[PDB]
Design a protein around this ligand. Sequence first.
Ligand SMILES: Cc1cc2c3c(c1C)C(C)(C)C[C@@H](O)N3c1c(nc(O)[nH]c1=O)N2C[C@H](O)[C@H](O)[C@H](O)COP(=O)(O)O
Ligand SMILES: Cc1cc2c3c(c1C)C(C)(C)C[C@@H](O)N3c1c(nc(O)[nH]c1=O)N2C[C@H](O)[C@H](O)[C@H](O)COP(=O)(O)O
Ligand SMILES: [K+]
Ligand SMILES: [K+]
Ligand SMILES: [K+]
Ligand SMILES: [K+]
Ligand SMILES: [Mn+2]
Ligand SMILES: [Mn+2]
Lengths: 498, 498
Amino acid sequence: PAHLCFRSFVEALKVDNDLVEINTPIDPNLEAAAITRRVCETNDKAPLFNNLIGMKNGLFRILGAPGSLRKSSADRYGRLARHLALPPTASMREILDKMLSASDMPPIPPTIVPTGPCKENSLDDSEFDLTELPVPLIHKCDGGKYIQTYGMHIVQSPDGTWTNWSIARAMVHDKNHLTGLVIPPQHIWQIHQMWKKEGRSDVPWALAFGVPPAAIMASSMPIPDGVTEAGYVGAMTGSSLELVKCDTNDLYVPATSEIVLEGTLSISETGPEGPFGEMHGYIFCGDTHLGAKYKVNRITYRNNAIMPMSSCGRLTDETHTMIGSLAAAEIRKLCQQNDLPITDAFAPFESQVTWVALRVDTEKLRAMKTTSEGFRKRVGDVVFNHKAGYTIHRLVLVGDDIDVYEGKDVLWAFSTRCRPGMDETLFEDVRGFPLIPYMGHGNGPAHRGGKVVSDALMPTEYTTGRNWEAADFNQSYPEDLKQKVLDNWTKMGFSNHH
Amino acid sequence: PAHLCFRSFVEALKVDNDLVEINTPIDPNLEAAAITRRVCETNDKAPLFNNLIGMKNGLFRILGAPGSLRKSSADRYGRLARHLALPPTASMREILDKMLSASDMPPIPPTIVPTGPCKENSLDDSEFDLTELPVPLIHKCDGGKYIQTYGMHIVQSPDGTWTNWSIARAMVHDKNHLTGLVIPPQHIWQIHQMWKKEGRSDVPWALAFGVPPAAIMASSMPIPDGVTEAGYVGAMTGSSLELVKCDTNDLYVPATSEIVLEGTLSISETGPEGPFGEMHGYIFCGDTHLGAKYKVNRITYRNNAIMPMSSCGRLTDETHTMIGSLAAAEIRKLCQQNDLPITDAFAPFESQVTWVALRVDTEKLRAMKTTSEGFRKRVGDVVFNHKAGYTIHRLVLVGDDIDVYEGKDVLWAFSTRCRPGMDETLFEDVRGFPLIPYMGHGNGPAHRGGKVVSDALMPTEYTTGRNWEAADFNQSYPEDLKQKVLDNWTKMGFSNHH
Ligand SMILES: Cc1cc2c3c(c1C)C(C)(C)C[C@@H](O)N3c1c(nc(O)[nH]c1=O)N2C[C@H](O)[C@H](O)[C@H](O)COP(=O)(O)O
Ligand SMILES: Cc1cc2c3c(c1C)C(C)(C)C[C@@H](O)N3c1c(nc(O)[nH]c1=O)N2C[C@H](O)[C@H](O)[C@H](O)COP(=O)(O)O
Ligand SMILES: [K+]
Ligand SMILES: [K+]
Ligand SMILES: [K+]
Ligand SMILES: [K+]
Ligand SMILES: [Mn+2]
Ligand SMILES: [Mn+2]
């Protein structure tokens, strides 16, 4: 099935009429990423580049925009639904519920199998050169060829008890090394730290590209510390994932992985990394810093391997649909587990996924007999002191009438119900997300503060209940009149799903 | 011409295929406003209700949505352009420049003429009853029938030197009185205060509905204190406006006015006013307060008179397209007159026109050799201490790459370049706009504070110049590649003005 095998996922997009196969030569230097960028900016069909200039020995085709949006509102999130065995018309609420469902289920550990398609071909250290592969230059100011935008890094705690799967960027350094971001509080960083403190050896590592779509979704989600993503994906899908051992280490990769790199993440060495055109929409040309360094010892890959690629930047791509939404999902749960009356959470695209709107059950709120200042502080302490709140700099609290999955409605509530200053609490002593330009390239500390809880609950939502109705068609007119108007609409001369 | 005669304006909308004539009976109790509301929420054609239940003796037809948006992007602002003799494809920049053009021209005073269409019919105090006219109930919780949503109040200073034209709401109180909002710092209020201090007499008053479209635009704009709107409109249009004297007082009304009320605004009496479904999208049911009281002594009107109506509330109507944009225009000029390097200003619809984005000439800014904290304070002091800043609670400063007329781009810059708290200055000792729910129905003083300058200039925009490029199709790819991609787009299989 498509959720369990990337090759099947590509076939699913084709059958959905959601994929454009480009069989003429396309340059991995900027052209593939430019086409992908335009797809993302216009919600077009995913591009599959079958004829990439410089592809050799089967490495590699590219699929762009794997988790981006479709044009129609009815199946807007269909490419995400296809990661998860959900109907293509699934709502965001349904997708995030699916992604949270495993959080109160027993893990289903993976099953080891002796081989799989990822072993169809191999290149040893004397046979590959990463500078000879058709690795894309994604943005013209990028500081490297970013091979790794949609693969899963696999690292394991020294004691073997936790195996983490996560997305973090990496670019080619030389024939057999990458550099990339490994930053706190991310799990790749947490595990790296464990190995560094042990001080014995570099971290055994693999990077698998074109993994089971359900696994790349979990890779992008801040599920709890110490939780092995493979078991969470197993529980979510109701099926044990099939993994095969790496040839040169004892880590396990999805059997149907398109391309696998095997090697080490150094506990001592660094190398130049970045800049990269990032999720918030910018590239700071020449802004290169030392990053984590990976050595590649072996490549294995499927016949006619396909590399997924995120051509990320301005709206809308994987960095918005997956980073933002999956963090919002985890934050929703975290708030509920802390006894806060939050029903729903979403990161508005309009905020460049730097905000999360939290829908409040105001019946529950009223029973708490609290105030804005107290509630704001409590919510911000829970979220901004936790890893799930890392990427989010503004929380907007809204009452039950707002659909947080609708950015227009979030912006309306924020703009009209939250008095600047008075209805907000600033948080300066929390971890900040340095990738946001106003953090890393701003006026203050790159790694601390810059966060805010903005309360768009109105005063009576804490006491006696909402005391307005909207000045809109829906609420300011009785049902019988509304229906008459709709029934006579085209008749009168005015204009009128899938 | 359409800009100088409301009847001609209606004819222009017809010819533009921007008007739906409804000749079957429509109820002024909610139905007309519900149809209008749906038009505004969907950017449909303006409705002209030719058969209003309860219309008698020629009073009256209704035109809804006179200044609302069209569906197509190419002529989005066409209904505003038709107020001003501009091409229907005019940009917002062009419309606001037209509205500011008279600010450095000599006034063209109006011309008195002996009669006009507004004198075709008359009703004396023994012949009309305002509770018998088909005055609309616009929202179901409104505290009155709001006769006055798109007419022009006309009041004159005691000394005769300043005649003000402005829009302020009013509803029917009884057979020969209205109540309405007359609040500081508005000119109707400033003039009222002059009469109250003189203490001799009630204020001579007229309310003209269906006035020259260019005059209703100025009526909605905060042009300076002491400036007679008629002379400003004269200069803007290059033509002296033709006015006729009222029958029962010595004020002058546009000759082609559809309906004119003549009477007095009391210096001593008040009456119940509101609630009303307001520009920010709400109605607070039962929230009635004492408002200003007007006595009507005489009605004059055109044959087959048409009453314009704003069915205001959630996006998008006259309260957004005219209040927000015309305040932004005046703020742009005010900033320039105070030697601030502002090129453009607009009130984003997404902010419910509570924000104004100010585009900065950053070459000029760099020459000032200043800082964020200093610049923010200076801009906020200029704007928030002036009447033109009354309705605006957040100013967003953006550099030259942002098109402030594009809300998506304003939201991007705000979300990514302004660090909450650190990059903002709050203003608590300025006049606030009580109509905003978080003001009048909020946690703090209804009439003071709640304002903020949010600086979305990046640090190097003050020093050496922008130091990024966008991670977008436009900026992250060379021109020749971009053009190749566009040229091969439909060929490859992807999707493609008026
Ligand atoms: C979907 C997606 C997620 C991420 C990234 C990308 C995509 C497409 C890049 C295009 C590669 C851009 C890059 O900036 N990137 C990225 C990243 N997290 C990082 O620490 N470093 C990164 O370079 N995340 C987010 C992480 O995947 C999530 O924060 C996840 O929660 C981490 O897993 P874990 O540590 O919780 O196990
Ligand atoms: C276009 C438009 C403008 C306004 C209004 C409406 C429309 C459609 C209502 C639908 C009637 C809603 C109402 O809230 N309303 C309104 C109002 N100003 C008020 O003091 N009171 C009001 O009740 N303005 C704004 C004013 O027209 C401008 O602020 C103008 O600048 C005033 O003129 P002046 O005092 O500068 O001469
Ligand atoms: K993860
Ligand atoms: K609030
Ligand atoms: K005015
Ligand atoms: K800033
Ligand atoms: Mn993890
Ligand atoms: Mn005025």
